[PDB]
Structures are given as structure tokens and as C-alpha cells.
Amino acid sequence: QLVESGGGVVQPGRSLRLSCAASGFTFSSYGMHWVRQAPGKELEWVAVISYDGSIKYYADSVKGRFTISRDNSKNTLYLQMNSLRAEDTAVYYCARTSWGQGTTVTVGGGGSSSASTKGPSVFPLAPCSRSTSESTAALGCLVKDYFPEPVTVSWNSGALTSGVHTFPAVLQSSGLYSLSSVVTVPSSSLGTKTYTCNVDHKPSNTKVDKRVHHH
């Protein structure tokens, strides 16, 4: 059993130390690896340490900034990350040469300098007019400008789940996240039935209900 810990939101140029607690085997006789995975990207090997800690290797993208270490009497692997860049944002796993479930590291003070956590603005997605001929219409909520991940979206307090699509968030140029949640409903129901999206962003303790109409 390998459990990673220490991940969190960090500002660029600052540091952060990740830990990897090992259990269920002889940690002292096996080499250890740090691997990372950026969002939407493949796996990237970060570092390796030998069983006795004598041999260490790094990836050149992190050389001089990251430092791998270990304690064989506490059975713990450590990764000290200095001068973090935005490209270091990734899920970090430790692996015995069995993987842990990883810990997420997000570099980017986006949101602002003195309130990195920022709640989202929720805007209705509604058609200009009720389309004739077309029997199905679509509605939604745009969840924009929040940090960090994640947000959850329900519809009608969970009573509406069929046909709901909540898209994965995208990272905007500002460094804030944005997504949309949509639902397909009958055109005869448009303008008469109520359709409310419920957005929850626990990092900022934000709970916003938004009714979707054309105005």
C-alpha cells in the first residue's frame, strides 16, 4: 500500500513537499519512483531513488528544482519541489520498482494574489426562441471563472438526470476554470416547465441555484 499526500494549490516560484507512505512490504529493499501526469497528457517519469538512497536520478525538466529522498526506518518517500512552474501541475504517484492513488498539485495563483480560491459565476444557456419543427431543445448553465477544481452541477435538485451532460472544465487564458452543463428537454416543455441548475464549488463554499430562461 502506497499513499501519497501533500498536494494542494501552490503559487508559482514557491515550493511544496510530497510524501509517500509505504506499508505491507519491505520498503528498505526496493527502489522508488515519482511519476506525474498532467491533465489530458500521458504519464511522465519524474524521479527515482535506490533502495539505500545512494543513487538518485531525475528528469531534466525538473533537475535542479526537485529533490527525491527517503527514510527506510519510517518507510516514507519524499519529493521536495522547488521553484514550481505552471507546467508542474499534475497528479503525482509514487511507485515501487504497485502504485498509489496519487496526490494532485496545482501551480498557479490564478484567482488573485490574496484570494486564490474564487467562486464561479453561473450564467444561463437558453435559446433565442422556441424552435418550431425541432421537437427537442437544449438548456444549460455556464459555470465560469472559478479556481480551483472542482465544481458539481445538478438539475432540479437532482430530480432531473436523464440527458444531462456536464462537460469537463477547460483552463482559460486567465488561469480560471470554466465549463458548461446542458440538458435536452422537449420543446413543448420550453417556457412552461422550470429548469434550475444547482452549482456547488466547495473550495469557495459557493452554492448557486440558477433558473434558465430567455428573458
Partner: protein
């Protein structure tokens, strides 16, 4: 460093098919290549190591072959749980390097998207930004083309796309394209249009709206 070229980056298949995934090393690595499998939100799992040696607990329908430069992962009689992303890893030297990855998804009948267009809300406009949203609903295959036109001027570099995971019940995808403008830039133009090209459409489909008519 040794580069592993993985092919293909995406692969469609049916349950019961035999699947082939390849990795080419930029230099000789002997037998020091393995295959991992990964599902969304979970840690990767080592399927094969030493080119051909299978890991314990992995079904015998997974097999591995290779010389010293070209390597192949083969999945016989594809099962529903085998749909995931697969990575090849070399460890003959340092740094350890992975392949680009192969997203293995389930094949289904061609299904055209349902296209909808959404204008920006006035409440967002009052903040200085306008997001125009084009939605492609429940389509297959995943490949599609979405073009924005503002007074028939094709837009480039001002839109972001987002795709859902393959739906667990009907095996389709959905896509959103968000066009971002300033409020001033938005109000200086009239007609906002989204054209969608997809295999399931006999011709590209346009959804548009008119400012001042909305």
C-alpha cells in the same frame, strides 16, 4: 532520452475484437518495455513487463511481443472492461519514458449530433465578456468539425472545445465549443453562427442567431 512512438492515439473496436497497439523506440531497448492500462480518475495498472511477461491477475487475453525497437500489445476477444487508455513504458535507461497513449473506445453505429446555439446572457454582458456556446449532443464517432462565423467572418483562436467521456449507456459523445469575445466586440456584430461537419450529417449543419432578434 529514448522516445516511444505509440500508435494509434485512439482506437475504435467492438467487444470480441482482437486489438493491436504498437510502440516504436527511437533506439534499441532490448526486452525492457512494459504495458500499462489506465481508466479515468484512477492510477495506471501494469499489465505486461519484459516485452512479453504477463503480470499476475491480468487475463491471458493480453499478450505482448516485440523485437528490440518495435513492440506490440495484443488484446484477444476484447471485453467491456478492456476499454481504457494504454501506455507503453521503457526502462532500459534513464529517463524512463512513456508512449503517447492509446485511448481504446467502443464502436457503435454512426449517430449525427444535435446542434444547438446559445447567445450570451445579459448578466454576463454587464461584466464585459460574452460567451457564445455551440452544443453537439449525442454523436458518434468522436471526430467532428465546429466552425464559428461572425457576420460570415471565420473566427480563429477565440474558442475552446470540451468533449465528454464516451457515454456509458449509448456510447456517444457530446461536445461544447465556447467562443469568447469582449462585450464591445460582441455588440459590433450581428449574426453569430456555428457550422458543424460530421460523418452522420449528409451536409454541414448551421445553427445561428441574430443580435437584436434575440
Amino acid at each position: 532520452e529514448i522516445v516511444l512512438t505509440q500508435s494509434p492515439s485512439s482506437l475504435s473496436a467492438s467487444v470480441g475484437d482482437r486489438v493491436t497497439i504498437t510502440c516504436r523506440a527511437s533506439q534499441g531497448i532490448g526486452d525492457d518495455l512494459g504495458w500499462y492500462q489506465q481508466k479515468p480518475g484512477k492510477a495506471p495498472i501494469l499489465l505486461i513487463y519484459g516485452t512479453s511477461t504477463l503480470q499476475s491477475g491480468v487475463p491471458s487475453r493480453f499478450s505482448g511481443s516485440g523485437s528490440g525497437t518495435d513492440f506490440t500489445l495484443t488484446i484477444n476477444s476484447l471485453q467491456p472492461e478492456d476499454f481504457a487508455t494504454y501506455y507503453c513504458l521503457q526502462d532500459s535507461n534513464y529517463p524512463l519514458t512513456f508512449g503517447g497513449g492509446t485511448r481504446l473506445e467502443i464502436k457503435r453505429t454512426v449517430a449525427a449530433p444535435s446542434v444547438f446555439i446559445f447567445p450570451p446572457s445579459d448578466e454576463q454582458l454587464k461584466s464585459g465578456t460574452a460567451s457564445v456556446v455551440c452544443l453537439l449532443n449525442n454523436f458518434y464517432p468522436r471526430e467532428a468539425k465546429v466552425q464559428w462565423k461572425v457576420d460570415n467572418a471565420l473566427q480563429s483562436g477565440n474558442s475552446q472545445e470540451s468533449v465528454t467521456e464516451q457515454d456509458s449507456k449509448d456510447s456517444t459523445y457530446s461536445l461544447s465549443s465556447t467562443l469568447t469575445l469582449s462585450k464591445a466586440d460582441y455588440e459590433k456584430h450581428k449574426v453569430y453562427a456555428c457550422e458543424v461537419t460530421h460523418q452522420g450529417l449528409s451536409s454541414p449543419v448551421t445553427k445561428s442567431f441574430n443580435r437584436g432578434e434575440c
